[PDB]
Assembly symmetry: C2
Homo-oligomer: 630 residues x 2
Amino acid sequence: TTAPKPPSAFTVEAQRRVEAELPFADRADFERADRGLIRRPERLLIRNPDGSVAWQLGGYDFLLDGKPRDSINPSLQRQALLNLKYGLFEVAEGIYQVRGFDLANITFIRGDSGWIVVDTLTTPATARAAYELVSRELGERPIRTVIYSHAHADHFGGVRGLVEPQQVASGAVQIIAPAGFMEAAIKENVLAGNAMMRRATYQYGTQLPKGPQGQVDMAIGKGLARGPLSLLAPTRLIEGEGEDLVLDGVPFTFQNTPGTESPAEMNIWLPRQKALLMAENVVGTLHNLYTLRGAEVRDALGWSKYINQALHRFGRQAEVMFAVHNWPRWGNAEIVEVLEKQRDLYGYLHDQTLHLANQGVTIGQVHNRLRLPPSLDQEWYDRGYHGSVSHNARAVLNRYLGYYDGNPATLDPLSPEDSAGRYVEYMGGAERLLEQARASYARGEYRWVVEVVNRLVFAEPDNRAARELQADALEQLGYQAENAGWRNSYLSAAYELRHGVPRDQGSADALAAMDTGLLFDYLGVRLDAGAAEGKALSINLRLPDIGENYLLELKNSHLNNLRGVQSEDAGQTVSIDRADLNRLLLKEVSAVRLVFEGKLKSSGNPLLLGQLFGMLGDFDFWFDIVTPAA
Amino acid sequence: TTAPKPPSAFTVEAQRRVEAELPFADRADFERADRGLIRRPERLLIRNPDGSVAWQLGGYDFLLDGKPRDSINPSLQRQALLNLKYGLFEVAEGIYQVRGFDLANITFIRGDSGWIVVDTLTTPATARAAYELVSRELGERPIRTVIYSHAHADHFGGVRGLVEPQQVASGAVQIIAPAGFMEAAIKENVLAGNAMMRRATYQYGTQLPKGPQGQVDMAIGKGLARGPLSLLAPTRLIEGEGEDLVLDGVPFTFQNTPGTESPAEMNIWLPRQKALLMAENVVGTLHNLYTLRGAEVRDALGWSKYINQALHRFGRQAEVMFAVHNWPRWGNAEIVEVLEKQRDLYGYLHDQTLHLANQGVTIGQVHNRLRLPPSLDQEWYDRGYHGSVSHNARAVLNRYLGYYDGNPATLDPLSPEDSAGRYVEYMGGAERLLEQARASYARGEYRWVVEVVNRLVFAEPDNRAARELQADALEQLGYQAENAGWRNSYLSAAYELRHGVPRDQGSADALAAMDTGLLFDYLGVRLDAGAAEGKALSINLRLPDIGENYLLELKNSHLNNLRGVQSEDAGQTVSIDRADLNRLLLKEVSAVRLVFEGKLKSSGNPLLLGQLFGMLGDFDFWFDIVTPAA
Ligand SMILES: [Zn+2]
């Protein structure tokens, strides 16, 4: 059947073990999550300018229940309720935080005559709503200082919700960020963008229903708010290892931690109330060293060090700690213990992975073998909600040693769809394979069943019996999975196997921020080698509104973009502004018109730039994952 | 049987396709390789001070034939037999190179009154041997400038063979290197060293005999010379993007290319002779973006543009090009097209991998589908000798998106040894799996056979029939394998599962160079969680011969070093020098003498440091790869 099955007896008993060993007599996190609530809006609906849904939490009503459901992991079910502790919160003399608007939090710190703000959610609407609440609840104050904690969309993404560019241009509003902020913001999210996003749909569960048979939590969040993406340039940068500043008469102490959530990130220390804002490093869960989305593997060793530096600099004198995702801690003894265990967590994760790896434990091997120590294992903020011990362990191994396990058997393997054919024949034809796979499904051997049947799934891309067996084999792992990404992934996969892929379905300031070089590297990725092959050309560009001068070269099916140098024996010369070249590529205007406006001047052959853009292709967003290409 | 089998009818057929499509007509590389020979010693051996072999070439006599052997790839033979053109070579007025004394080359540049040297090779023996040859061939001149091209052992490894610390300390000898050299030099082959080196045994073929049914070449050189490792610190660093300098009345122009072969690396331009030294960027082959030994993936994008910048600054005026591994090129028209294609090669790899990846292609597919264009595919320096299109392509995908293919079937798989049993049972189990694999082996489905039989190999670790068959299947791929690492690996694997794993079997300068932080991280890696756990301590180090102050902490089975800080309610304080803490760790001396000698000061409980070092474990070098743990 094409509909979610109930949990198996093995699945329920697995949920019993999670509740058995792992200690949840201690619900103190709830006690800390509520506490200091100012006022909780009873209905939450946030709306976009175009009219669509940005954010809504009535889809999660079913968790208010306070009753265990064995289609969800009871540890994840905790973290789900604790992220339903939404509303506006006291921390501080002068320190308040809005929460449950959006995946991230937003911090409001009262300057003697205005607001100082950390981070802007994910999209303008969520930021608007938060600012209107803060304004309505504790008096209307103008925002004067905006702090990007680090380069990630959920934190900078709703900046024009709060402020207009003219307010920054007048010098009446500050924007502060850790050095290298712009660099980090983009460069990731770009050249492998289509793949990451399409992969992400599994991780987040954009497909998913919002029920006990579906999405429940995003672990640092309920989920990601969904609208446009804003970004404004940092006026000030926190260079070096950190800086102590005064802004609207409030003392701040920034501490750079490059390499942790992000390549540019910093922790904030507020002295006259002894509050420590630990950024995305220290949060209510084990974080991703390697997001399943697709990313460069993050440095867990430097992550641990920078927590340890943060402990000795601040932890002693800090009596309240809080973060950009999730919810604060009070009493310095609790804070110190947390920071110690968080430091040692990522450290243990790094050191013991490499310890095992050095005894020849493979990238296949390790996740099954590496198990946490009781002291770390047995606190909540160390549970694999966002990150996971498993996939973080093989991320670390992958970072140091790459993908290749060591065995040459796995060195030049066939594509799984080409080897799928054989794997089926060998077994016993298609249907013998089925009933022993289905026998091992009755055993409770689920994470075997997924690996094996997946081979038949690729051999037989339309075999209903294979697809919907694999589906409820996967979806059962999704039920008992503690990790949110894992759950959402297993369920999004099953949903797609059963009901097919969606047949039926960027942001300006990101592209404006995007460096000319990087943009043209993305154009070179987009290039079609079929058109390419054999041809060769040389285009000069002049971009006067940024003042940068590029040289484009095409030989051997590859495009090459070179700043600020250009040969005069080239094929064509082009003169065009940056902001309108964006407009051209964003597909808001045509080129011919740009010519008649008097801002596209060309000498030499006029046709090369035309052909080149003809050689550029595009990528189908909805490509298959759990099946071969249809 | 347990001996190498001759090639199959499919292997020979494959070797004759290699003859067919590749342009073997043009053997120009041979007359370039021989070009400028001063004298070729008839009989080379190089010895160590201890008395062992450092380097020979009498093992490769079989390739001086010129007659095709289908147990080897004909393109690999070609590259092998080109790398046998050893001896001392002229390049231009005042530019000389020694090749075939080690994996690398060593360059000698005529100053008006002394030598200027680039690279010092694997070990002191080989370097000294080269300097003696240069002396008695063209006159004994003193070396007074040493240039490390980049941070890699095959280039800096034999520095002590040329110069003493005497001569550097006086200021009579210069050591020049690109900025970030040393740090680059170490951190990489450290924390995952044991793993990296044991894996390397396959890649290099340290076990392998040296025949047509064994090791043939190392692609960028015959193999690696094998003695001690020497390292002397850089006196001056090339900072920024580059620097133009004069040494002994000779003009140089250094161009930094950080992120290629190495995190710290530079191309050298000699304007008088008009020659271009391109370091490890442009060589006689496609270079690794990911060494199979195990490393973080190299940035191919930056590689391509730093080649393009070199082309435009030098290539126009360049008249002879040469490199640190292999052999030069003459005539600027050739140079330019080489640099064009080399640039466009790495750029095509990077771009079209991501093109395919953004179009939905997984890590398990890309290598099969990505195929080079004719212009690049057909030239010798673009052939996958050292690197390979296949494993480089997956490395790029792995860099941007990590190991996870996308399918949750592959998310939480079993360790192959745990799933091995079931793969056997339910193909029908051990012997009926065997004959159908044999049936596949009779077709020439070799790279299938290796994957499937390997499951049985892990299920049944001592099953001769499985391991011998797998060996024959593996080695026959190694016969056809154009890539040298691939050949050496496939063969090394086959040898190991045939004859078992060898039952019967560090550097000072490196360890003195190794940062105190990094060292203590490696200690933290070496920690045994078993002993550790539950325990907690706080050691407090003073290191006066370097003047650095460290705090060691142990909680939650994890060790945390921290410089420039130390708490005065710690557990135990210690004062000890670097140099003798090295001699302690290296096991040159015991701690007790080091006390009585008068260099070990201890305050507070003095037992903690002793206990901590007790908690430290160690790693067996010879672990199993192609079998499970015996
Ligand atoms: Zn976030």
